[PDB]
Design a protein around this ligand. Sequence first.
Ligand SMILES: NS(=O)(=O)c1cc(NC(=O)Nc2ccc(C(F)(F)F)cc2)c(O)c([N+](=O)[O-])c1
Ligand SMILES: [Zn+2]
Length: 257
Amino acid sequence: HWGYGKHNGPEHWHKDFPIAKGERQSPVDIDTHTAKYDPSLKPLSVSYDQATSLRILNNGHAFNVEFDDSQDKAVLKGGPLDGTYRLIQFHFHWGSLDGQGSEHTVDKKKYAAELHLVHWNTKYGDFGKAVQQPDGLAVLGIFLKVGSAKPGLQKVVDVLDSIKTKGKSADFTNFDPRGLLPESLDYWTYPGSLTTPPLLECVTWIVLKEPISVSSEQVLKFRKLNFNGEGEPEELMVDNWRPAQPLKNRQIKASFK
Ligand SMILES: NS(=O)(=O)c1cc(NC(=O)Nc2ccc(C(F)(F)F)cc2)c(O)c([N+](=O)[O-])c1
Ligand SMILES: [Zn+2]
C-alpha cells in the first residue's frame, strides 16, 4: 500500500485515491504577499484545560497521540469556524534533515517538522461522519524550527523508544497539549484536505504564523522511529510529508496584517 517511498510515495497516490488530483488538496505554499487580511476573522479559541490524552501509537506512517473525544473536553472554536470542534489526536510530519520536513511552506521556506492537531465538528456526531463533510475537520498546523528545546515536548520524545515499530502503542495519560502552542495565535486559513490517504477534502486548515523551537536532539529522536513492524527490515521513519499542491481556485486568508 501507500507510503512515502520511491515506489509508493505521494506521486503514486492518485492511482488508488484519484481525489489526490482534486480541487482543494493540501498542503500548499503560503505566499505571504498574496494572502488576504480578513478583518472579519475572529480570534481562535483554544480550550485544552480539560484534555484527556489516552495513548500514543506508531501507525506505520507517523506517531499519533490520541485523546478522549466522547465529550467536549478539549475544543477549538472561533477563528473561521462555526461550531465546536473536538480534539481527537495530534501527530507530526518531519524530515531526514533540518531543512525539510514540514508539509505547508511559507514563501517556499520549509521547516524541520509540522505539528497537526486534528479536531472534528461535533454537529456530525462522530469522526467517521465528519470526514464526509466539507466543514467536518479543523486541523491546527504548527511549524517547528530547530533551536532551543521545547520543554513541553520532552514527554513525547521520551516515550518514542517504546513505540519504535509499526503497530506498537503505549499508555500516554495526563499529557497537556497546551505545552506545544506558540505565544501568538495569529494564523492563515484556507479550505483543504487530509494530507495522507484517503485525502478527503474535509478540512478547514488553520496554520499558525509563529513556529515553536525544538532542539536538534529532540527532532533526532523522531527520526529513530521505524516505518516497518517488529522483525521486519528496518526503514527509518523520515520524510513523511507530502509536497505542496496547486492552490487552484482558493484564497489564503490571514488573521493579521
Ligand atoms: N496529515 S493529516 O491529514 O492531518 C493526518 C490524518 C490522520 N488520520 C486519518 O486520516 N484518519 C482517518 C481518516 C479517514 C477515515 C475514514 F473516513 F476513511 F474512515 C478513517 C481514519 C493521520 O493518521 C495522519 N498521520 O500521519 O498519522 C495524518
Ligand atoms: Zn498531518
